Design a binder for these strands. Sequence first.
RNA 1: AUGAUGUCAUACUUAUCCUGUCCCUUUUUUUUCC
Lengths: 105, 81, 111, 109, 99, 115, 237, 118, 355
Amino acid sequence: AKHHPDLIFCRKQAGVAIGRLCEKCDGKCVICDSYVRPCTLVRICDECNYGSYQGRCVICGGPGVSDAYYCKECTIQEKDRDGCPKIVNLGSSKTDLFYERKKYG
Amino acid sequence: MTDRYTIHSQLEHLQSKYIGTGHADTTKWEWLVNQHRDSYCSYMGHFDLLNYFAIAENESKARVRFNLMEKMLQPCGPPAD
Amino acid sequence: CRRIVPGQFLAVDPKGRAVMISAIEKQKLVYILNRDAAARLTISSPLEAHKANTLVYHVVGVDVGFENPMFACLEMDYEEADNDPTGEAAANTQQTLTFYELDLGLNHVVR
Amino acid sequence: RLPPEVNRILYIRNLPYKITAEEMYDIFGKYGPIRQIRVGNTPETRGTAYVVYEDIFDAKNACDHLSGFNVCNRYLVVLYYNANRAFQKMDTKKKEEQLKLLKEKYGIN
Amino acid sequence: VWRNTEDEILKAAVMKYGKNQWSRIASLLHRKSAKQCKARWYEWLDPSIKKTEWSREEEEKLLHLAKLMPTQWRTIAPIIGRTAAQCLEHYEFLLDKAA
Amino acid sequence: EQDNRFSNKQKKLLKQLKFAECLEKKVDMSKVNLEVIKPWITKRVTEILGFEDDVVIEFIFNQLEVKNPDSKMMQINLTGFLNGKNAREFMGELWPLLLSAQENIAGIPSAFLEL
Amino acid sequence: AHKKAIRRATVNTFGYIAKAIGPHDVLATLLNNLKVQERQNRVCTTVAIAIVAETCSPFTVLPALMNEYRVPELNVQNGVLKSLSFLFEYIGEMGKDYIYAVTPLLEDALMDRDLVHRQTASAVVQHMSLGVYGFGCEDSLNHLLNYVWPNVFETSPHVIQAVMGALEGLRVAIGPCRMLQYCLQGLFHPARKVRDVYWKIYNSIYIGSQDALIAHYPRIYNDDKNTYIRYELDYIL
Amino acid sequence: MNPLTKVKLINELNEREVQLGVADKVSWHSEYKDSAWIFLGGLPYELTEGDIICVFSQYGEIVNINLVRDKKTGKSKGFCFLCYEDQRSTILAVDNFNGIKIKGRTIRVDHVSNYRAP
Amino acid sequence: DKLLVDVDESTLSPEEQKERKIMKLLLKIKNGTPPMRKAALRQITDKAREFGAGPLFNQILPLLMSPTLEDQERHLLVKVIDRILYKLDDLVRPYVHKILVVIEPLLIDEDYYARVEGREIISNLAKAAGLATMISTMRPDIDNMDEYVRNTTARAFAVVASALGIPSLLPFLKAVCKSKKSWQARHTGIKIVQQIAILMGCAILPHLRSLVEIIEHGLVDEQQKVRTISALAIAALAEAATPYGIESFDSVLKPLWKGIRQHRGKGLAAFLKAIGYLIPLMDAEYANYYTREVMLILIREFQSPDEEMKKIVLKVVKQCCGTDGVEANYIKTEILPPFFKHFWQHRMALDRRNY
RNA sequence: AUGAUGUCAUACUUAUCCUGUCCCUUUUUUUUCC
Ligand SMILES: [Zn+2]
Ligand SMILES: [Zn+2]
Ligand SMILES: [Zn+2]
């Protein structure tokens, strides 16, 4: 997302499987990282919906609870045409916070 | 060093992903030829510019489309080196 | 009307199974269409046939009975003609008809 | 019964400069056979010592016992060595010929 | 430790407030305690701390005293007019250049 | 594919490499018999690396099988196992041998015709 | 609260009571936030002010905000700039009424010494132009683009990335003919820091609207051994 | 998966039971109130019934023992069945001997539901 | 230890030794406050190429070999090794095998985040150092005696093949699987293929035919371990290539169905897992016959005590007797009574997966 | 009318953080016997 530049997206061909977000992350656009005006639905790459990953939070990786949408901006500038936005790197943040957790308590 | 070669990889990959972008050492020739080739695909697209040329010359739209796609191969003369 | 985004050429295979949509360069897609339970129409996810530096003069489906569908697209490959400072490969570069082919078994598209 | 980091390789700090190797061979001698001993030379290594017993058991005995020894108004630092890397090749030639000696020697194969 | 910024704020705060309310003062800077402010001021900051090198006579007195009253630096340091820290390290330094 | 921060070491090495001389005559394998050639390769490498290495052998064989082998890529892929200069050599001696067997009518190389 | 759902709900309730009573009371208290602990936030108060101004139409608040822009304290100037950003993102199409009002503020930010004012002012322009898409307010967007452009040589990632965002927003709102006219002279500059920046911008255009760019390229004279002019475009009928 | 993992299994099972602190009547052993036969596996190819009984008597008396050796060469196949006198003893043996190292070979011990008399 | 004594930097005329000294900022990275950590990390990221690989790794890897490594320290060191890997791009070519010899354990460990880290950084190292380097370097581990390294190698290979795309690496595989010196090589080859399928999943379809050709030659081999592991491979392939690809497996079926009747113990468990996954990929008629055949054997084994026997039959029942093309009362009568008698036991519950 | 380097602290930006989660790590001398 716009906030950790170390993150990556799948960027293969979109498909027909809709994308879902955890209850934790829910309520936002995936890219413009805002919280408003959902216009259109997300679609994800075939691999990025294969396997156990049926119904996972694109971002948080967790349980699918709702649908994932696109802000009015991103759909106006057509940033919504770059295929799977599935993030195929976990990122340092989750790792480090879990590690400090295991240390502390 | 690091800047030059990571931006070089990013520009070579972004270009091989989008035909026709540029990078800090794009030469006049590649710029101009990508710009022709896009003009050509767009004349064949817009159903109408085709009518304009096919009336300006006196050819028929099939022959016009054919000559465009003939030229898209090497439109601005042969390369420069 | 972009260069590498498909839409210009459209082809379908006679027995109705697959449609392919192709750009003028570098991108071709294939969708499969199957009747559902209520026999309403259903569309697959796109397959992919990308191949760099290749114009396409015309695409058309080939008729085969319920076998793998084939699409047979005129072509031409400008990549080397780009690097012929003399101007030869502009001539002596003749266009190659090339039967692509869906592969229902493995679910992809092979030249 | 051994914690498997114990080794016949010991590493020793807080060494009096220009101690006699005689003195030292004695010190570590009450503990077991000394396969070899080396002392640092450069000012950085001058004053530290790698001491190699010929037995893991005298090794552990020593490391556990003389640990914290008072020599020349200072306590002695002992440690187990982490021989975790190498600095030379293994000399295929000599290895191969000594092993040919062994194989023809006991007519194994 | 102390940074020159905290140091300057200390100077000004003291000259305004007088030497007696260290609570208000330490309330001012973050990550500073009233005990520390008091200590630092009397130790280093206050102008009466004479900051020069030791005279020969000063070192005579120091050495002689630290021989007279072993290890009592907060007893000595008033007698030669420096802090316990100055007397301490500087006696260490004389002792090391001797040996 | 996914990342544009790491450089394709294929293109990089293809640029900065020192290749052999005759690796540019295209060669197909349909024009050729192989099991005549193999023992040459077998003994050759067995000499170069001074022992037997089944996986290296089969590596070259499988590299050779497609209708058009890439001599540049096979040069590179061997550079690891061989000395690197021994790579360019072994190429400078094979590739022409394929040229020979491919100009032949039977598909058999000339030195092995004399032999 | 170190959780986010809490802060979220908080802001939404601030909107609700604003509706309950009337914008002025809550807005005055919200503005009294200089709340040093900057992020973890006074930022969420910024969002709250945005929702206030949105739910009861921004007639009311915009004078209060533009007023606060005077209080010489930094974090509160930046507060008003952010709140503007969110304001325009939230209300969307209605900016066609307040853009004339707001500009001379943004002008003032874009022409000052520090990066935080320029980075936050650039966010504003992005959202504003995306909201005014298609309504004919282009002259003022064009003027704001003239102030935005010179930051294009900059280093701190947050400001360089805010600026690039602003530029593509302005692309959809001004057209690409404009951005292309701005981007020409440096495609081939002798420097290389500039040529880097300019080719980055010109790509970000060409990827979008690479079709519109057809009727916009300049006419470039052909030399001896090539032919660079497209004549099919002036076949005269 | 190779059998030492199947020792890991039973030991993890026990410790998990203690971990949840669950009561004995609902302890996984409880499903075999009806068997005094316990399976031994991984025995070295050398142990004979003398040594087996000697060692495993440690929790009671043995009613029967059957050590499957290959009849054609007579040699031990390395696994056996054991009938203790009283279920409780088998519970103890399953707890305590699952994982002991005899002559290097870590033996695995378990209950047996429907022991087949050969 | 060096940091204990002190000496002037000029006197440290071995300016590489000066470099080493200042490099022992590593200690600040290891132990130290968050700000020490951040500043040190920036230091090293940007002075990376200035330092160069040789010193860096020669002074890092001993740490990672420490028996007394805790968790934080470890993940910290992997953080750095990653960042310097992103700066030094080629210079690692001499140091790959070292990097693997240390990273590999992260591939097999109970921590989840440790697995994902180690896997990712091997991907990155594979992308950085060129393929030919990876291949030539970590071949000799295939044959290596100790199984620990054989196993961890197979896993690593699968990762790198994901990074550099299968059709590149395929010929090397084909060589390994049909090696002839010793069978451990073949076993590790087949293991590689298993781990690929497991890892990449549906990215496999276009190569399924080639893979199965590679691997089936072990389905019949007289060695026992190779047969078992091969069957597990086939099952992994199928579970990835769900409904598709059956025309590619057609070549391998009969040996499966041959071995299924007449095997005992282990091979039975494996071959059962394979046919299990295959069944849904089949077509309702072919598959219905095959099904009603297999459910015969299946019934027989509910009462087996062996663990993986029980687990395999669990998953299989799910698939076969959960197919569209079967009937209510058949299941209701012949399957349900034994199923519920045997499988519902408190020992199941206490296990994690079986749950 | 400021260069750089600075283990120089303070400001400041990112609605980033601060709850997410451990499920395919199970790896070896085939070995549950009517
Ligand atoms: Zn968005
Ligand atoms: Zn995807
Ligand atoms: Zn989430």
